[PDB]
Design an enzyme around this catalytic site. Structure first.
Site, PDB file in Angstrom:
ATOM      1  N   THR A 159     -13.384 -21.856   2.805  1.00  0.00           N
ATOM      2  CA  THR A 159     -14.676 -21.101   3.117  1.00  0.00           C
ATOM      3  C   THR A 159     -14.979 -20.112   3.480  1.00  0.00           C
ATOM      4  O   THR A 159     -15.974 -19.224   3.471  1.00  0.00           O
ATOM      5  CB  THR A 159     -15.246 -22.273   4.441  1.00  0.00           C
ATOM      6  OG1 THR A 159     -15.723 -23.332   3.463  1.00  0.00           O
ATOM      7  CG2 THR A 159     -15.994 -21.983   4.952  1.00  0.00           C
ATOM      8  N   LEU A 689      -2.050  -2.625  -8.268  1.00  0.00           N
ATOM      9  CA  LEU A 689      -2.541  -1.380  -9.307  1.00  0.00           C
ATOM     10  C   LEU A 689      -0.538  -0.822 -10.057  1.00  0.00           C
ATOM     11  O   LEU A 689       0.062  -1.234  -9.917  1.00  0.00           O
ATOM     12  CB  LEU A 689      -2.787  -0.198  -8.500  1.00  0.00           C
ATOM     13  CG  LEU A 689      -4.042  -1.017  -7.195  1.00  0.00           C
ATOM     14  CD1 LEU A 689      -3.276   0.103  -6.108  1.00  0.00           C
ATOM     15  CD2 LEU A 689      -5.180  -0.815  -7.995  1.00  0.00           C
TER      16      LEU A 689
HETATM   17  C1  LIG Z   1     -10.021  -3.861  -4.203  1.00  0.00           C
HETATM   18  O1  LIG Z   1     -10.975  -2.580  -3.835  1.00  0.00           O
HETATM   19  C2  LIG Z   1     -10.497  -2.652  -3.077  1.00  0.00           C
HETATM   20  C3  LIG Z   1     -11.335  -1.464  -1.990  1.00  0.00           C
HETATM   21  O2  LIG Z   1     -11.411  -0.477  -2.891  1.00  0.00           O
HETATM   22  C4  LIG Z   1      -8.977  -1.466  -2.721  1.00  0.00           C
HETATM   23  O3  LIG Z   1      -8.335  -1.587  -1.888  1.00  0.00           O
HETATM   24  C5  LIG Z   1      -8.183   0.373  -1.897  1.00  0.00           C
HETATM   25  O4  LIG Z   1      -7.256   0.658  -2.223  1.00  0.00           O
HETATM   26  C6  LIG Z   1      -6.975   1.998  -2.092  1.00  0.00           C
HETATM   27  C7  LIG Z   1      -5.451   2.666  -2.283  1.00  0.00           C
HETATM   28  O5  LIG Z   1      -4.515   1.418  -1.911  1.00  0.00           O
HETATM   29  C8  LIG Z   1      -7.231   2.360  -0.651  1.00  0.00           C
HETATM   30  O6  LIG Z   1      -6.741   3.632   0.226  1.00  0.00           O
HETATM   31  C9  LIG Z   1      -5.704   3.722   1.116  1.00  0.00           C
HETATM   32  O7  LIG Z   1      -6.357   4.156   2.416  1.00  0.00           O
HETATM   33  C10 LIG Z   1      -5.696   4.021   3.267  1.00  0.00           C
HETATM   34  C11 LIG Z   1      -6.576   4.113   5.024  1.00  0.00           C
HETATM   35  O8  LIG Z   1      -7.959   3.339   4.379  1.00  0.00           O
HETATM   36  C12 LIG Z   1      -8.270   2.791   5.678  1.00  0.00           C
HETATM   37  O9  LIG Z   1      -9.422   3.323   5.707  1.00  0.00           O
HETATM   38  C13 LIG Z   1     -10.310   2.864   4.995  1.00  0.00           C
HETATM   39  C14 LIG Z   1     -11.548   3.279   4.414  1.00  0.00           C
HETATM   40  O10 LIG Z   1     -12.858   3.055   5.165  1.00  0.00           O
HETATM   41  C15 LIG Z   1     -10.734   1.227   4.762  1.00  0.00           C
HETATM   42  O11 LIG Z   1     -10.784   0.244   4.086  1.00  0.00           O
HETATM   43  C16 LIG Z   1      -8.649   0.440   4.962  1.00  0.00           C
HETATM   44  O12 LIG Z   1      -9.283  -0.903   6.092  1.00  0.00           O
HETATM   45  C17 LIG Z   1      -7.527  -1.504   5.823  1.00  0.00           C
HETATM   46  O13 LIG Z   1      -6.770  -1.665   5.891  1.00  0.00           O
HETATM   47  C18 LIG Z   1      -6.680  -2.346   7.872  1.00  0.00           C
HETATM   48  C19 LIG Z   1      -5.829  -2.571   8.154  1.00  0.00           C
HETATM   49  O14 LIG Z   1      -5.204  -1.881   8.697  1.00  0.00           O
HETATM   50  C20 LIG Z   1      -7.295  -4.153   6.762  1.00  0.00           C
HETATM   51  O15 LIG Z   1      -7.948  -4.630   8.033  1.00  0.00           O
HETATM   52  C21 LIG Z   1      -8.340  -3.919   5.578  1.00  0.00           C
HETATM   53  O16 LIG Z   1      -8.438  -5.206   5.873  1.00  0.00           O
HETATM   54  C22 LIG Z   1      -7.882  -3.167   4.917  1.00  0.00           C
HETATM   55  O17 LIG Z   1      -6.583  -4.087   4.880  1.00  0.00           O
HETATM   56  C23 LIG Z   1      -5.922  -3.673   3.513  1.00  0.00           C
HETATM   57  O18 LIG Z   1      -5.989  -2.201   3.022  1.00  0.00           O
HETATM   58  C24 LIG Z   1      -4.533  -1.503   3.740  1.00  0.00           C
HETATM   59  C25 LIG Z   1      -4.400  -0.329   2.515  1.00  0.00           C
HETATM   60  O19 LIG Z   1      -5.195   0.653   3.059  1.00  0.00           O
HETATM   61  C26 LIG Z   1      -3.361  -2.986   2.793  1.00  0.00           C
HETATM   62  O20 LIG Z   1      -2.246  -2.041   3.448  1.00  0.00           O
HETATM   63  C27 LIG Z   1      -3.404  -4.190   3.919  1.00  0.00           C
HETATM   64  O21 LIG Z   1      -2.770  -4.518   2.720  1.00  0.00           O
HETATM   65  C28 LIG Z   1      -5.299  -4.927   3.217  1.00  0.00           C
HETATM   66  O22 LIG Z   1      -5.125  -5.527   2.070  1.00  0.00           O
HETATM   67  C29 LIG Z   1      -7.819   1.687   6.410  1.00  0.00           C
HETATM   68  O23 LIG Z   1      -8.039   1.285   7.335  1.00  0.00           O
HETATM   69  C30 LIG Z   1      -4.690   6.259   3.031  1.00  0.00           C
HETATM   70  O24 LIG Z   1      -4.526   6.373   4.037  1.00  0.00           O
HETATM   71  C31 LIG Z   1      -4.114   5.722   1.807  1.00  0.00           C
HETATM   72  O25 LIG Z   1      -4.041   7.447   1.599  1.00  0.00           O
HETATM   73  C32 LIG Z   1      -2.065   7.480   0.982  1.00  0.00           C
HETATM   74  O26 LIG Z   1      -1.985   7.396  -0.552  1.00  0.00           O
HETATM   75  C33 LIG Z   1      -2.570   8.668  -0.406  1.00  0.00           C
HETATM   76  C34 LIG Z   1      -2.581   9.021  -2.620  1.00  0.00           C
HETATM   77  O27 LIG Z   1      -3.836   9.050  -2.587  1.00  0.00           O
HETATM   78  C35 LIG Z   1      -2.254  10.443  -0.496  1.00  0.00           C
HETATM   79  O28 LIG Z   1      -3.360  11.380  -0.243  1.00  0.00           O
HETATM   80  C36 LIG Z   1      -1.487  10.437   1.454  1.00  0.00           C
HETATM   81  O29 LIG Z   1      -0.576  10.705   1.779  1.00  0.00           O
HETATM   82  C37 LIG Z   1      -1.647   9.282   1.908  1.00  0.00           C
HETATM   83  O30 LIG Z   1      -0.178   8.292   2.640  1.00  0.00           O
HETATM   84  C38 LIG Z   1       0.504   7.934   3.705  1.00  0.00           C
HETATM   85  O31 LIG Z   1       0.106   6.964   4.333  1.00  0.00           O
HETATM   86  C39 LIG Z   1       1.180   5.688   3.457  1.00  0.00           C
HETATM   87  C40 LIG Z   1       0.773   3.785   4.212  1.00  0.00           C
HETATM   88  O32 LIG Z   1       0.986   4.874   5.765  1.00  0.00           O
HETATM   89  C41 LIG Z   1       2.261   6.419   4.061  1.00  0.00           C
HETATM   90  O33 LIG Z   1       3.414   5.367   3.317  1.00  0.00           O
HETATM   91  C42 LIG Z   1       2.434   7.975   3.554  1.00  0.00           C
HETATM   92  O34 LIG Z   1       4.437   8.034   3.835  1.00  0.00           O
HETATM   93  C43 LIG Z   1       1.658   8.705   3.947  1.00  0.00           C
HETATM   94  O35 LIG Z   1       1.545   8.867   4.924  1.00  0.00           O
HETATM   95  C44 LIG Z   1      -4.860   5.092   0.656  1.00  0.00           C
HETATM   96  O36 LIG Z   1      -6.128   6.191   0.443  1.00  0.00           O
HETATM   97  C45 LIG Z   1      -8.102   1.417   0.365  1.00  0.00           C
HETATM   98  O37 LIG Z   1      -7.358   1.305   1.664  1.00  0.00           O
HETATM   99  C46 LIG Z   1      -7.981   0.055  -0.086  1.00  0.00           C
HETATM  100  N1  LIG Z   1      -9.456  -0.618   0.842  1.00  0.00           N
HETATM  101  C47 LIG Z   1      -9.537  -1.603   1.004  1.00  0.00           C
HETATM  102  C48 LIG Z   1     -10.363  -2.133   1.673  1.00  0.00           C
HETATM  103  O38 LIG Z   1      -8.050  -2.733   0.963  1.00  0.00           O
HETATM  104  C49 LIG Z   1      -8.018  -2.457  -3.763  1.00  0.00           C
HETATM  105  O39 LIG Z   1      -7.142  -1.633  -4.168  1.00  0.00           O
HETATM  106  C50 LIG Z   1      -8.569  -3.078  -5.183  1.00  0.00           C
HETATM  107  N2  LIG Z   1      -7.987  -4.552  -5.046  1.00  0.00           N
HETATM  108  C51 LIG Z   1      -6.964  -4.134  -7.118  1.00  0.00           C
HETATM  109  C52 LIG Z   1      -5.889  -4.987  -7.272  1.00  0.00           C
HETATM  110  O40 LIG Z   1      -7.752  -3.893  -7.561  1.00  0.00           O
HETATM  111 CA   LIG Z   2       2.242  -1.217  -7.325  1.00  0.00          CA
HETATM  112 ZN   LIG Z   3     -15.043 -27.696   3.281  1.00  0.00          ZN
END
Ligand SMILES: *[C@@H]1O[C@H](CO)[C@@H](O[C@@H]2O[C@H](CO)[C@@H](O[C@@H]3O[C@H](CO[C@H]4O[C@H](CO)[C@@H](O)[C@H](O[C@H]5O[C@H](CO)[C@@H](O)[C@H](O)[C@@H]5O[C@H]5O[C@H](CO)[C@@H](O)[C@H](O)[C@@H]5O)[C@@H]4O)[C@@H](O)[C@H](O[C@H]4O[C@H](CO)[C@@H](O)[C@H](O)[C@@H]4O[C@H]4O[C@H](CO)[C@@H](O)[C@H](O)[C@@H]4O)[C@@H]3O)[C@H](O)[C@H]2NC(C)=O)[C@H](O)[C@H]1NC(C)=O
Ligand SMILES: [Ca+2]
Ligand SMILES: [Zn+2]
Ligand SMILES: O=C(c1cc(OCC2CCOCC2)nc(C2CC2)c1)N1C[C@@H]2CN(C(=O)c3ccc4[nH]nnc4c3)C[C@H]2C1
Ligand SMILES: [Cl-]
Ligand code: NA
EC number: 3.1.4.39
Length: 805
Positions: A159, A689
């Protein structure tokens, strides 16, 4: 604490909230225990019921009544939904014939047709046909509007994961609600249906439709209804909201029903007791529709009728107990039921071992009704791994069963006869979609589609720009009359090289041998035209795929197949070839069994070598275009070029060999030729990815030859199979898979039998959308066809599920 001492007079179902402690009067105050003292009296009136009777027609407005049959009701916007039928001789909406709605017919001052999302819990897809005689309103929607024979939920088919996917277009792994029950180790907290914890915004990621709307200046009705507010009051409240002045009236509205799910759990999905919940839902639909017709909004509003998941037959005696397998059953916490998730009961314990638990659960009983997985080995189509809240160990449970930890858990918890949560490809879990209104098509059936695609459509219907999500925007344009979003092909980022003969055999030192020194100008300009891409229109039917990231790669042509060879990963990113219905399977000649030949188009430094495979006692190798399907003894030499080679564990080579030697030919027979694209996938961090080079955790020993985590194929042919694959003038048909590249076959319990007893079932399990393969590889397929792009996006989102009807 609230100072629950203010009042609600003229604030009933107010639209913006108020800060604690000023008492509340919105549709969620109850659930926060924060309603004003008088909320029930003023806002939840019931006096006289919900319908007009002949002797009410005219009456003196009496503020006490739940709804009004008085004269000024229409203009106060608070008549009973049946007022005109009873007091002004009008007809019910359902008794009216349908007339196509070519344009919105809205009252003056409406800037856009409103959207009403009517969602129904547990509304199994076959209900549309099987309960049709008793849901006439729903039936009229379905047949006058746009409808799918079913819509696929996401996994787990629970759900909250599903309602929040509907709201966000996100997989649960990305939105964060990965179950109706979760443990977050970084928050150190649990999340349950019952309780306050679910109210903390830290669990909810993504951007839901109501927030997307607000941020762009479209006003939203508040989507959530406290469970004591009965259905008739929810409908009346939406109808009232719809009477507000232009500047206060929301543009999007949600109604939610706990039925038929609540009953399906007690009586099973087709229990005799199920007929009534369905009549009731139908009657609520009639009320919304008779109410829109009264307000002349019935040819103005777009209505979406949508379920979160279906329902299956489940009983307490179909439960498997983990205590019948594991001796240490007390160091484990199980999240139980229709799916299983296992962690350690304590992380102070350094004696807790996932491997031995998994092994203790693998293929232990002949008829076992669940299978354990490490989460990164679950089928990629579930997209169920990339969240810290998803336990490393997972059990996929057979439809109709439960898994529990001990028997004490089941009798100190038969309550129930139905449940849901199983694998989202399962028929009994499928659910419904109907779209009706000026923006949807007239009497149109569309193919089944996934519920992740809906957020995009609800954004189009409201003129919003969707936050980034997992839908493929444009894939549901065929649902709509207008408003469409015009998608465009992404730009290719790397363009290929086309290398000619640049290297002499002796520059290679790869430790590879081939018995091929065996020796006419006629047959020579010929073999050379094959290396220039003479036969390329035969094997490359839809254009070369586009590489959407920065990298270095070569196109290589051959008589039988064409490839995009990556100098970075030392193997092809993709191999394309067509096998026509007539084509013939030959065997690998004995002399050529160990044959691997250098590619004089590609340098030693960008080549694999045979030595590394020899030294690597774990890893053996395979070929992407299969030697068995060579068009001639001569062409077969091409299949042995080191640039067609890929690394494969012996256990995986059994799968792969059977797919190339038997199943390609079979598919060519049934589908009238197939085109095949195959290649490697690298997803070491299981995010769905493409990995970059610096993310690879494993190499063929003592080499830079990276090991794939999976291998994909995409198999395309003509939708009209009277046309061969290579000369199709119309729509295409596709199926694909993403096989995990695993050193053992512990996943298939029958793997010690002949491949014809198990390989194909495994493949079925790992069925995929072409879109999943795009995410995983950074490629973009079907660039050159005669089809419209919209239709191609629909094809790329198709999943072939192998369920029956
Ligand atoms: C389905 O679609 C979704 C949405 O489009 C796709 O997911 C996106 O993918 C992107 C690529 O992986 C990702 O972009 C990254 O975001 C980082 C910051 O993002 C924050 O802000 C956004 C925007 O408002 C927000 O959505 C995020 O929310 C997540 O996190 C909180 C928890 O903290 C949760 O409550 C929330 O539900 C969500 O959780 C999920 O996402 C995270 C990933 O962010 C996962 O880890 C979880 O497991 C969970 O599933 C964030 O708060 C940004 O900082 C990243 O940037 C790094 O990489 C780039 C490369 O371009 C670079 O420029 C930088 O140097 C940077 O590296 C640095 O950070 C690293 C990590 O700390 C570190 O290791 C390095 O050394 C550096 O310091 C990056 O751009 C985007 O966040 C998500 N969006 C969502 C909603 O998940 C998804 O891929 C699609 N799925 C498929 C299969 O296609
Ligand atoms: Ca991968
Ligand atoms: Zn039910
Ligand atoms: O009011 C909402 C709501 C409605 C919405 O609707 C979202 C819209 C999004 C746009 O598309 C349509 C649905 N979203 C969200 C949460 C996700 C944010 C919440 N609720 C109240 C209901 C209480 N409930 C149950 O008691 C229950 C039901 C079925 C079960 N089976 N097994 N155990 C069960 C327990 C299911 C809850 C859903
Ligand atoms: Cl759950
Ligand atoms: Na080896």
């Amino acid at each position: 604490w609230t100072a629950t001492s203010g009042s609600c007079k003229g604030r009933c179902f107010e639209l913006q909230e108020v800060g604690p402690p000023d008492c509340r009067c919105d549709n969620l105050c109850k659930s926060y225990s924060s309603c004003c003292h008088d909320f029930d009296e003023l806002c939840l009136k019931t006096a006289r019921g919900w319908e007009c009777t002949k002797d009410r027609c005219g009456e003196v407005r009496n503020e006490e009544n739940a709804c009004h049959c008085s004269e000024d009701c229409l203009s106060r916007g608070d008549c009973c939904t049946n007022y005109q039928v009873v007091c002004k001789g009008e007809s019910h909406w359902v008794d009216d014939d349908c007339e196509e709605i070519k344009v919105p017919e809205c009252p003056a001052g409406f800037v856009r047709p409103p959207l009403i999302i009517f969602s129904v819990d547990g509304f199994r897809a076959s209900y549309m046909k099987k309960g049709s005689k008793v849901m006439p309103n729903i039936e009229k929607l379905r047949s006058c509007g746009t409808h799918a024979p079913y819509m696929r939920p996401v996994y787990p088919t629970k759900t909250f994961p599903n309602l929040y996917t509907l709201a966000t277009g996100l997989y649960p792994e990305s939105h964060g609600i990965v179950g109706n029950s979760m443990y977050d180790p970084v928050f150190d907290a649990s999340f349950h249906l019952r309780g306050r914890e679910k109210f903390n915004h830290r669990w909810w990621g993504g951007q839901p439709l109501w927030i997307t709307a607000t941020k762009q200046g479209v006003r939203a009705g508040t989507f959530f209804w406290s469970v004591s507010i009965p259905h008739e009051r929810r409908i009346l409240t939406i109808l009232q909201w719809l009477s507000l002045p232009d500047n206060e009236r929301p543009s999007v509205y949600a109604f939610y029903s706990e039925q038929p799910d609540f009953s399906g759990h007690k009586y099973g999905p087709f229990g005799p007791e199920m007929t009534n919940p369905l009549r009731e839902i139908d009657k609520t639909v009639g009320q919304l529709m008779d109410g829109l017709k009264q307000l002349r909004l019935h040819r103005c509003v777009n209505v979406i009728f949508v379920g979160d998941h279906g329902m299956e037959d489940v009983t307490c005696d179909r439960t498997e107990f983990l205590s019948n397998y594991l001796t240490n059953v007390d160091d484990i916490t199980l999240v139980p039921g229709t799916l299983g998730r296992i962690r350690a009961k304590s992380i102070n314990n350094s004696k807790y071992d996932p491997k031995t638990i998994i092994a203790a659960l693998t293929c232990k009983k002949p008829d076992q009704h669940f299978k354990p997985y490490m989460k990164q080995h679950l089928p990629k189509r579930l997209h169920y791994a990339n969240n810290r809240r998803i336990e490393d160990i997972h059990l996929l449970v057979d439809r109709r069963w439960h898994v529990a930890r001990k028997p004490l858990d089941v009798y100190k918890k038969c309550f129930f006869q139905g449940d849901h949560g199983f694998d989202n490809k399962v028929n009994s879990m499928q659910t419904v979609f109907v779209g009706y209104g000026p923006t949807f098509k007239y009497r149109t059936k569309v193919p089944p589609f996934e519920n992740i695609e809906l957020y995009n459509v609800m954004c189009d219907l409201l003129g919003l720009k969707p936050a980034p999500n997992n839908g493929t925007h444009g894939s549901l344009n065929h649902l709509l009359r207008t408003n469409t979003f015009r998608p465009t092909m992404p730009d290719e980022v790397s363009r290929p090289n086309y290398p000619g003969i640049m290297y002499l055999q002796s520059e290679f030192d790869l430790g590879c041998t081939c018995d091929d020194k065996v020796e006419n100008k006629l047959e020579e300009l010929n073999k050379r035209l094959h290396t220039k891409g003479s036969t390329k229109e035969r094997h490359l039917l839809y254009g070369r795929p586009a590489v959407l990231y920065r990298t270095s790669y070569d196109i290589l042509y051959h008589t039988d197949f064409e490839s995009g060879y990556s100098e970075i990963f030392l193997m092809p990113l993709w191999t394309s070839y067509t096998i026509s219905k007539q084509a013939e399977v030959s065997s690998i000649p004995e002399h050529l069994t160990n044959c691997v030949r250098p590619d004089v188009r590609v340098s030693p430094g960008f080549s694999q070598n045979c030595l590394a495979y020899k030294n690597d006692k774990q890893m053996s190798y395979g070929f992407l275009f299969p030697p068995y399907l060579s068009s001639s003894p001569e062409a077969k030499y091409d299949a042995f070029l080191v640039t067609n080679m890929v690394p494969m564990y012996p256990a995986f080579k059994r799968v792969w060999a059977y797919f190339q030697r038997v199943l390609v030919k079979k598919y060519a027979s049934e589908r009238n030729g197939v085109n095949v694209i195959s290649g490697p996938i690298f997803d070491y961090n299981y995010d769905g990815l493409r990995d970059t080079e610096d993310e690879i955790k494993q190499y063929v020993e003592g080499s830079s030859i990276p090991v794939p985590t999976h291998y994909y194929s995409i198999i395309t042919s003509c939708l009209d199979f009277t046309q061969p694959a290579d000369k199709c003038d119309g729509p295409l048909s596709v199926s694909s898979f993403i096989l995990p590249h695993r050193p053992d076959n512990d996943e298939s319990c029958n793997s010690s039998e002949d491949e014809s007893k198990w390989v194909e079932e495994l493949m079925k399990m790992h069925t995929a959308r072409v879109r999943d393969i795009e995410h995983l590889t950074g490629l973009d397929f079907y660039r050159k066809t005669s089809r419209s792009y919209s239709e191609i996006l629909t094809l790329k989102t198709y999943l072939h599920t192998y369920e029956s009807e």
